[PDB]
Amino acid sequence: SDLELHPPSYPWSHRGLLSSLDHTSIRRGFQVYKQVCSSCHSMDYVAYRHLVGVCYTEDEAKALAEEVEVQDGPNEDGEMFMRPGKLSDYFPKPYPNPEAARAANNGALPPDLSYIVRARHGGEDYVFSLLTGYCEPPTGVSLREGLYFNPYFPGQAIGMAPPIYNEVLEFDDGTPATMSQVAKDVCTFLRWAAEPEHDHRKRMGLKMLLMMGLLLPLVYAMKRHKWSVLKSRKLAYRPPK
Amino acid sequence: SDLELHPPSYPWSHRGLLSSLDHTSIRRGFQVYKQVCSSCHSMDYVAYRHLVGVCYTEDEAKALAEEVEVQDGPNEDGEMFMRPGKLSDYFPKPYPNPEAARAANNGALPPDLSYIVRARHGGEDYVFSLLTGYCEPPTGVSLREGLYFNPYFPGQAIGMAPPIYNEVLEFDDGTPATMSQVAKDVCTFLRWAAEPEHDHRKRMGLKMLLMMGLLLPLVYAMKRHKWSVLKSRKLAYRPPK
Amino acid sequence: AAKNVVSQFVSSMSASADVLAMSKIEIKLSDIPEGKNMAFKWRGKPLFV
Amino acid sequence: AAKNVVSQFVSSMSASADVLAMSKIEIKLSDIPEGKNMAFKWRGKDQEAAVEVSQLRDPQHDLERVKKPEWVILIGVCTHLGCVPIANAGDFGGYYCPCHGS
Amino acid sequence: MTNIRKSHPLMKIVNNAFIDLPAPSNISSWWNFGSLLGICLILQILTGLFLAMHYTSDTTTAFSSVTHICRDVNYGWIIRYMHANGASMFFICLYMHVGRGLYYGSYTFLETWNIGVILLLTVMATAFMGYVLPWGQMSFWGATVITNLLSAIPYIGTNLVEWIWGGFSVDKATLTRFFAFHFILPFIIMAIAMVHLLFLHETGSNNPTGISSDVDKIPFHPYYTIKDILGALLLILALMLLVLFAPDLLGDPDNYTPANPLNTPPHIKPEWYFLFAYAILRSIPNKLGGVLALAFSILILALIPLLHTSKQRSMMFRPLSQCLFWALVADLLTLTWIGGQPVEHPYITIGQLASVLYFLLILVLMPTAGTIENKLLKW
Amino acid sequence: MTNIRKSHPLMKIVNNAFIDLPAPSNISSWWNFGSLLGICLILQILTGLFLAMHYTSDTTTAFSSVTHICRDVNYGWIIRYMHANGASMFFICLYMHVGRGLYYGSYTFLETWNIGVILLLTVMATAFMGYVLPWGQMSFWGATVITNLLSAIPYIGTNLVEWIWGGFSVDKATLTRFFAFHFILPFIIMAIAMVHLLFLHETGSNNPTGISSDVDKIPFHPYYTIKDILGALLLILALMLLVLFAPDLLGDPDNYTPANPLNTPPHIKPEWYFLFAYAILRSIPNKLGGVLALAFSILILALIPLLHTSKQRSMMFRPLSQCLFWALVADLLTLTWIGGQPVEHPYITIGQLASVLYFLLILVLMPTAGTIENKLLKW
Amino acid sequence: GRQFGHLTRVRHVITYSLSPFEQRAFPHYFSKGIPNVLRRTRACILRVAPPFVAFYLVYTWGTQEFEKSKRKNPAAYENDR
Amino acid sequence: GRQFGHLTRVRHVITYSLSPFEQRAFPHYFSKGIPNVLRRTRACILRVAPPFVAFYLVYTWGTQEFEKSKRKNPAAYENDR
Numbered sequence A, B: 001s002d003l004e005l006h007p008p009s010y011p012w013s014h015r016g017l018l019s020s021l022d023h024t025s026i027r028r029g030f031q032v033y034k035q036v037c038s039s040c041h042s043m044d045y046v047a048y049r050h051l052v053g054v055c056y057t058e059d060e061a062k063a064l065a066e067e068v069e070v071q072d073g074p075n076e077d078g079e080m081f082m083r084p085g086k087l088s089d090y091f092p093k094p095y096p097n098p099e100a101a102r103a104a105n106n107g108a109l110p111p112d113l114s115y116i117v118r119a120r121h122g123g124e125d126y127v128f129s130l131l132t133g134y135c136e137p138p139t140g141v142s143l144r145e146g147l148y149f150n151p152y153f154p155g156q157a158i159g160m161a162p163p164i165y166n167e168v169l170e171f172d173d174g175t176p177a178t179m180s181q182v183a184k185d186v187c188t189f190l191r192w193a194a195e196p197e198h199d200h201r202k203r204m205g206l207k208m209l210l211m212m213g214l215l216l217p218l219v220y221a222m223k224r225h226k227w228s229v230l231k232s233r234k235l236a237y238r239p240p241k
Numbered sequence C: 001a002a003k004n005v006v007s008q009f010v011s012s013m014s015a016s017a018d019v020l021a022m023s024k025i026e027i028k029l030s031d032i033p034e035g036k037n038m039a040f041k042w043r044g045k046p047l048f049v
Numbered sequence D: 001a002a003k004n005v006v007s008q009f010v011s012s013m014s015a016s017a018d019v020l021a022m023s024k025i026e027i028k029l030s031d032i033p034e035g036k037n038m039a040f041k042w043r044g045k046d047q048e049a050a051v052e053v054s055q056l057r058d059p060q061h062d063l064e065r066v067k068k069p070e071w072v073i074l075i076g077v078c079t080h081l082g083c084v085p086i087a088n089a090g091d092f093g094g095y096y097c098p099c100h101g102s
Numbered sequence E, F: 001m002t003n004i005r006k007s008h009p010l011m012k013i014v015n016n017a018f019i020d021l022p023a024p025s026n027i028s029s030w031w032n033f034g035s036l037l038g039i040c041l042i043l044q045i046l047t048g049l050f051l052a053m054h055y056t057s058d059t060t061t062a063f064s065s066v067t068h069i070c071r072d073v074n075y076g077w078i079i080r081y082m083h084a085n086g087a088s089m090f091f092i093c094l095y096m097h098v099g100r101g102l103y104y105g106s107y108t109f110l111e112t113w114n115i116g117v118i119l120l121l122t123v124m125a126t127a128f129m130g131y132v133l134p135w136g137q138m139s140f141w142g143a144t145v146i147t148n149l150l151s152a153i154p155y156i157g158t159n160l161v162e163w164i165w166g167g168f169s170v171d172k173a174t175l176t177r178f179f180a181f182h183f184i185l186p187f188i189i190m191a192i193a194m195v196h197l198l199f200l201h202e203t204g205s206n207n208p209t210g211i212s213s214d215v216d217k218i219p220f221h222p223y224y225t226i227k228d229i230l231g232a233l234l235l236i237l238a239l240m241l242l243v244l245f246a247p248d249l250l251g252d253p254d255n256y257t258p259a260n261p262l263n264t265p266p267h268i269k270p271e272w273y274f275l276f277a278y279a280i281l282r283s284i285p286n287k288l289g290g291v292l293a294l295a296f297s298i299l300i301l302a303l304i305p306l307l308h309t310s311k312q313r314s315m316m317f318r319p320l321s322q323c324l325f326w327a328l329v330a331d332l333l334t335l336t337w338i339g340g341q342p343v344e345h346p347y348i349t350i351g352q353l354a355s356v357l358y359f360l361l362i363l364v365l366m367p368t369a370g371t372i373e374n375k376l377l378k379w
Numbered sequence G, H: 001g002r003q004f005g006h007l008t009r010v011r012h013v014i015t016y017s018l019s020p021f022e023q024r025a026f027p028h029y030f031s032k033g034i035p036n037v038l039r040r041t042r043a044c045i046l047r048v049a050p051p052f053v054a055f056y057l058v059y060t061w062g063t064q065e066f067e068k069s070k071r072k073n074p075a076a077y078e079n080d081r
């Protein structure tokens, strides 16, 4: 029975219709996951195939891929692998198992974030706010210890300790790392996640439109051209009477 | 390029049309698997649901089931468990894995025997012979060490060491255990395996037959009853001419 | 045979004997002192008892 | 329309980014001398290794003594052998000849 | 018909049920719909088909495959949405086809109606199962609800639940049974489609004016075919426009959440178009009451032709009833938004209000009105 | 047609394409087949359908499900075999329908033939995919062969392989693509079925005697309907008799062996009915040669109506050709057993013998014969 | 019978028409048609719109009516007791 | 037209028949029909059977012809050399 707050709508690089994603921040925001969210929340669904779309050179992310993986491979010739090899591989999960996952976070179940944007209502500003907002417990409230008070959380208490502060990290660029920037630099990343085709798919939009304005007036011409006769009728009642 | 031998057709308790299976030997032959074939070859497909069909009392095979099973159960609240509980469970495989399986038998791959009857040509006498036959290497032949010469095997050399000798075991009954008996007592067992409904399904056979002889002459009567007129025609050409 | 066949049809879709095998395997029921919580496996939702 | 349009439906059938990962990059492996064995499958398993991916047979061909270098193997191998071999059909007799086994 | 390519194969003689089908002069775009309907049906057929290829129903695995579908499959993403994004459009194509029905009251054609009736009833049930396929949470519980809604039958209700279930749960059988049905089913609908057309070609088309137009007719092949050509593609636009720019707009159902049998979402509503029917479920406190309320609620359509009392057909010459007609329209549109909300009291009463309001509109008012006009009009 | 329940719904007027369909007097049981055919088609439809429910195609899992099917599913075992054991019977129902064709040479009806042609060609291809479903080894390699047989096209052949494959292997796409096709397909056949009937009801039936019977005809509803009633159920007997007592008799394909991509069985032959076609594949040393040999081999049927040279129709009055007719029969039946054997020279030559023998029988002898009879018979 | 032949009986009607090429696809389309908008847009608008307006009120009306009902607990009872 | 009416023209044929109840479903079925077996069974059997007999020979003929060809290696070459 919390008043459900809604995030103010922010402009974005992608916000507008034809507005695209910018990979520069996407590259950075990856590192964040490479740094932070690999703690608990996973993303299982994307191969290392990102390469050039996130601008990664074939070698760049391949060699980047190489370090990520590396587990066993010697069980009586039955294996998996160390050192992924190709890009098809996915991320190691920080937990093998919800049992292993939840207990580690002590009753909390970190969700997989792959599509989570499309899950939660209200787009990215949901999280960016949820990133931003942490408030001082009001007078007359208490929390479960792990739960940390943000009105953005639905029950407004979350076991997630605020990860982001100004310069949690250093970006790949060397850009000065800032709580908001570090936060805002990621907000493009998952927005990309659920829809890799996003950038590409918009092409058809402009493609179809100019294609579209073509034919309709054309059709609209033809139709009338036929109907030109019917609406041109005359009638004459000239009875022999 | 071995001359392919064919097993002489033996009579059986089930051989004839209405000839049923007898569970007394089936109960025994189970123990054989419970003794022998659990070595390597598995059968994955049947629950402990056998109970009363193989005559096992509900408790009888349940308590019998209880002993058979399986490992562990303590992995952070996840996994399987000890002591099967219900009958739905299947047998533990002596090998986790074809890798584990084949190497253990050193290049040989023991097959699962569940349907194997229906796989091999020539019914049960295929195996019973293959059980029976072991011959003395002819002059001018040699073998792979594990391979043991039987003309029944297609290449006529098999890594399976002959399991069955007279009184390998003691039957559940206490029947004196005999290589042929021990062999022949099993030959009904798998014959049952691929077709549990076998005994039951035959019922419909006699059911339909007497049902069948009913209607056809009946139909055969009716049809004619109509055609009675047509084949009764006469024609008269009485031209005014 | 209409009563054979129409029936033998329907009862197919009805229930898997193995699905039936999975109703209330939990029997237990003691294992647990008075107030002392054991657990069991219900119709497939967890049960504290 | 259709030229783009029908393509899309059709191309779905065509191939997938999954097995697109095949066409060995690895290969890499391995054996020593005889073994053979020496197969896997992977419908293929550049090579690379080096180079190679010409072929010898299916299932860890892997080359003709890898042109005398490595192969696995490197001909001889166990019964019958690597290329000639024979090891042709069940398993005799035509081997990998041809002529020079390459 | 000398050397006419119509009769040479006997087949094309049948094809003269179209070319020379006479047609009425004055016709709203509102008569595009009948032909417009079949359009969606076709275009669909392909989409779910090629989609059917890479997808598989296996209770553990199935949903996972879908992820694979829009991502690694050639153009997998455009396709999923297509089959989906047609669906609602198709339904809006539906009601309109109905919509024309009463506004001109063409239901005078008698069994044809009843055909048009049954034809529909199947269709909605179809995608219902179709909506299970994605295996989302909302799917899962939504599935879980309605069968649990069924059971209330006084004596025999019980088994039929676990009979359709095939167990105590929502598991495999419940699913993969349907993947047949949600698939096998629509064809028979197509088979049915032609039948619904046949009867119409007993009598020929109806008009706007409730006036037999027989004095004037038109060869169909030249003309309405054209207006079709226009009317057809127009659909595609928004259909293709929604899909790309704002795909998830009508994708209001949010769950790609792998369905947790234990966990329950904060909210369960069926997808957009059910909801008024679903809303009316809430109304009756009697759980059984709402059932005979809900299912019957649409069955009223069968009952309309019984209540035509007037001496002239098309509404457009009876102004009074026309009010009711619209009056009913929003009343439908009303129940939506109420249905579009949870079960708090201010809505509840409001929801409780329009229910009995609803029937009165159709069941009494409409038949009541025309009588007086006759008297008013001296009939 | 006063108050006749035929015209009251317009629909049942169509239903008078049957009741009052006139019919020939003297008719062999050999005319039961046409109606007999559709019988199998129906009974099938249900079987694979309910079977489709518990089964799933997933390359790893799928076959496993089947084991579950005949075992733990209610009456699962009777059902599998049914759908299967109908199949071959249906084919033997097929050729007979053809069989009547030439023995009375009714193919005089022209495009109707061509219809009956295409109608078939699909059907065999159908179960071909259907046979993949069990995922047995013999399925797997048998599947693996024929596509690998396709590739020999000089320029474009390559891609089409991996195009139909959807990869370098036999894997998922190859399978689960088909589980659509092997399923979706037969309906359209049923749709096609009626068409093939229509044309026949242009001219009415043909006879034994090659003599227009128009002097005498019979109302169909009373009589042949009866002989149907008999002729229909008779099938079921052996059909139900084979299935229970000796299920695997025709179950000659032995593989419940989970298909090993690496491992190859000691023998690969397609199932029984292909084999003569498959046999003829072996004949040509040219791999391409056998292709244009194999596929064309059946296409000859299209070409028969071109070669009718006689002045009287039904064979039963031309004794000489009748020999060829039978002479051809065993020749077919011959290729079976040769096809039923491996590739070993005494058979090889023998197989190599009947090939060119085969065409000569049809292609030359048959047209050659009748000419002389005319002259012999003073025509 | 033949769909057009036996339709009806009609007497002493006369029809006049041109080739479509004789004329244009926009015979004063703008000028002539734009007035027509009103006579139809005014015709029904008397009969149709108002019911919706009532709805729209209810939309805000009940929402507002809803809103207070929960949103503020220290309303009927303020946080005093 | 109407299928039966306009079929053909026929003149001065006469037909004679009874109710089916007037007679039996087995008017000397056995006695009368059993001879008929032959005249049909003999009619075609002249024209039909023999080709198959040739086949059946070939069946055994080639099989036998096959059999030696492999079955015994110490045949053409005995195991001497």
Ligand code: HEC
Pocket (backbone or CB within 6 Å): A036, A037, A039, A040, A041, A105, A107, A108, A109, A110, A111, A113, A127, A146, A147, A157, A158, A159, A160, A161, A163, A164
């Ligand atoms: C402490 C390990 C950890 C860290 C580091 C971490 N997550 Fe959190 N996260 C969790 C856990 C556990 C929860 C839920 C806490 C609870 O349930 O009380 C959570 C909450 C969340 C939630 C909302 C919970 C939900 O159901 O969606 C999101 C989204 C999320 N994390 C993503 C992130 C993001 C984004 C970051 C980087 C800012 C991040 N995680 C870093 C473990 C972590």
Ligand code: HEC
Pocket (backbone or CB within 6 Å): B036, B037, B039, B040, B041, B105, B107, B108, B109, B110, B111, B113, B127, B146, B147, B157, B158, B159, B160, B161, B163, B164
């Ligand atoms: C030594 C462990 C072992 C024992 C004990 C054993 N099996 Fe064997 N069995 C094997 C292995 C391994 C092979 C194949 C040997 C080879 O491939 O050279 C084999 C051969 C067979 C075969 C034929 C191989 C095939 O492909 O079908 C069958 C059938 C079989 N076993 C079943 C049985 C039966 C019946 C018994 C009881 C008489 C039995 N096994 C006991 C391991 C065993």
Ligand code: HEM
Pocket (backbone or CB within 6 Å): E031, E032, E033, E034, E035, E036, E037, E038, E097, E098, E100, E101, E106, E107, E109, E112, E113, E115, E116, E117, E119, E120, E193, E196, E197, E200, E205, E206, E207
């Ligand atoms: C997808 C479903 C349907 C399809 C494909 C379909 C198809 C058609 C077509 C092609 C026509 C002729 C053009 C027209 O009059 O609209 C038509 C007319 C009609 N249909 Fe259906 N229809 C469908 C649904 C329905 C339904 C649901 C009903 C009634 C509940 C219905 C009742 C009618 C009626 C009454 C007509 C004649 C309407 C008139 O005279 O204007 N149809 N339909």
Ligand code: HEM
Pocket (backbone or CB within 6 Å): E040, E041, E044, E045, E046, E047, E048, E049, E050, E051, E052, E055, E080, E083, E084, E087, E090, E126, E127, E128, E129, E130, E131, E132, E133, E134, E182, E183, E186
């Ligand atoms: C009017 C026609 C149809 C409708 C309304 C319909 C309904 C649905 C629904 C509700 C879904 C799930 C919605 C979603 O996934 O977003 C769906 C997807 C699907 N439908 Fe249909 N169905 C129709 C015809 C078909 C046809 C013709 C096929 C197959 C040839 C089919 C098979 C499928 C399949 C396989 C899917 C999986 C794609 C997916 O769920 O994402 N349906 N359809």
Ligand code: HEM
Pocket (backbone or CB within 6 Å): F031, F032, F033, F034, F035, F036, F037, F038, F097, F098, F100, F101, F106, F107, F109, F112, F113, F115, F116, F117, F119, F120, F193, F196, F197, F200, F205, F206, F207
């Ligand atoms: C399952 C496939 C088929 C079905 C369901 C089917 C159905 C029928 C039916 C009901 C008839 C009328 C009764 C009869 O004359 O037999 C018929 C006749 C005929 N069909 Fe088909 N038929 C099938 C296959 C074929 C094929 C494969 C051909 C030619 C290749 C064919 C050509 C004919 C011909 C020529 C006739 C008329 C034969 C005569 O006058 O005796 N049909 N078919």
Ligand code: HEM
Pocket (backbone or CB within 6 Å): F040, F041, F044, F045, F046, F047, F048, F049, F050, F051, F052, F055, F080, F083, F084, F087, F090, F126, F127, F128, F129, F130, F131, F132, F133, F134, F182, F183, F186
């Ligand atoms: C003349 C009609 C049909 C034929 C000849 C045919 C062909 C086949 C074949 C060759 C098999 C595998 C053979 C076997 O499993 O032993 C099979 C099984 C199957 N067929 Fe069909 N099909 C036909 C119609 C259908 C229909 C109508 C369906 C589904 C409604 C269907 C779906 C299936 C399915 C699901 C199986 C799985 C059962 C199994 O493979 O054991 N087929 N059918």
Ligand code: FES
Pocket (backbone or CB within 6 Å): none
């Ligand atoms: S049914 Fe659960 S609350 Fe109404």
